[PDB]
Amino acid sequence: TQRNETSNYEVDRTIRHTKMNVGDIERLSVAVVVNYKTLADGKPLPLTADQ
Amino acid sequence: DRLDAALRFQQEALNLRAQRQEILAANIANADTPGYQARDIDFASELKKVMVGVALTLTSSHHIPAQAVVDLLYRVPDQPSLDGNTVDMDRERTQFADNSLKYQMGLTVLGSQLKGMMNVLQG
Structure with a gap:
């Protein structure tokens, strides 16, 4: 037995050219502080877990 | 190419003569093999077939x-041997000499055609 096989293929091709924007954000860290709650009496009652 | 068409016939004849020469020499070499059939080719028909693909x-x-990657006809036996060998010395010796002569003639004709095509160009 003898099998000689030659195949020429055409392939899908996708070229993407990208120029990233200058000034993009890499990592953002934010510090927020809130106050207590002073009722009509004036006692600084702290907030709750849900809030 | 037009150059191939002019030299196609003589090249094919020369190649067919070489192939038949090999076949005749194989018949001579295997003369003593018991059960060997003497094979040969019909020169004219094969020359038609070659003279008459998709890369x-x-x-x-x-x-x-x-x-990239001929049909052999059995010779009609003349004398019946006991070992089944049908190769006859005289017939194939004459055929061998004739094929040698025709190979030389084809070489001569092809060389003459090439030499003429050359002296047309020389100047």
């Missing part, structure tokens, strides 16, 4: 080009 398409550079 695969190459889209780019990497694509690989297409890769």
Whole structure:
């Protein structure tokens, strides 16, 4: 037995050219502080877990 | 090419003479093999067949080009041997000498045609 096989293929091709924007954000860290709650009496009652 | 068409007939005749020469010499060499049949080719019919293909398409550079890759007639026996060998010395010796002569004649004709095509150009 003898099998000689030659195949020429055409392939899908996708070229993407990208120029990233200058000034993009890499990592953002934010510090927020809130106050207590002073009722009509004036006692600084702290907030709750849900809030 | 037109140059091939002019020299096609003599080249095919020369190649067929070489092939038949090989076949006749194989018949001579295997003369003593018991059960060997003497084979030969009909020169004229095979010359018609050769004188009377599709390279695969190459889209780019990497694509690989297409890769390329006669009928033997039994001789009618003359004398019946006991070992089944039908090779006759005299017949194939004459055929061998004749094929040698015709190969030389084909070489002469092809060389003359090439030499004429050359002296047309020389100047």
